[PDB]
Amino acid sequence: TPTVRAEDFLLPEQRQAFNEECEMEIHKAREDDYYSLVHNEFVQHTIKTECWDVMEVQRSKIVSMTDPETEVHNFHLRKPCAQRAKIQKKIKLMRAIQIKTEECFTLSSLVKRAKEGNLCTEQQVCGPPSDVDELLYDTLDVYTGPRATIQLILLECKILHEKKSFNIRFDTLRERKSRELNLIAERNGRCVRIMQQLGEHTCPPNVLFTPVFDIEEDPQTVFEVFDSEIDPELLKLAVKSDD
Amino acid sequence: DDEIDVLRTDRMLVAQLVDELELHQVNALCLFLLKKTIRNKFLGVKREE
């Protein structure tokens, strides 16, 4: 009968063993889930540090209004190890000195400059000229390891100039579409209010302009918990919470 | 969006120049390989003799 239970069929030793085992299961499940959370946060901090905080110039991003999936980022930069800046300044000054010094043994005497119409498939730089655009080597004088390293850092300064000029015009585009998106949001609110006043409440989403904020455009939005991603049963459990 | 896509094209335009540089790195790397592999093989031939 329903007044008779599997518990009744049990003997007291089995009852004590089953109860203590399940309560051990309960406490250990609780504590192991708690440490699961704990190492979750610890891993999150490690991820933030090593990826985000190590980067000097951070991974900001553009997404165009008509192309919600196409993304444009400013270029990566790590926080400098002090050799970076020490090199940069000391080398640029002594490299002007190297322009004027005219010392080492030159192999360029054998070769006379000529012209070729296209050479390789075309490449081109953008923005204002770099300093290194004025500060590159010759083609034959580079035949020693240290001069090759100095050429390496000259090309690195080229890297810096291109990344910067690109990213300043990139951020200027950021600011322009920022003021456009602010005014677009205000106009969208105005249009919604006008349409609701007229009685045309069923405004299609194609009339209001696309507010294409990709969450990775401001990547710290992608850090969060999106509780929409929580499982619906876990959401139902979470509803009963008072805070 | 016109500006955005033109900027995307200019990204390629800049990045094409980037390929030159690691090539120079490998140039210096190979010369460094050279200078000591020479002595290694030469002394190998020494003690074979």
Binding site: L107, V142, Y143 | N27, C30, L31, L34, K35, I38, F42
Partner: peptide, 13 residues
């Protein structure tokens, strides 16, 4: 080959 190979990576660089 030692001598000429030194010279060849000197010239070809």
């Amino acid at each position: 080959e030692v001598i000429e190979k030194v010279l060849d990576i000197q010239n070809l660089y």
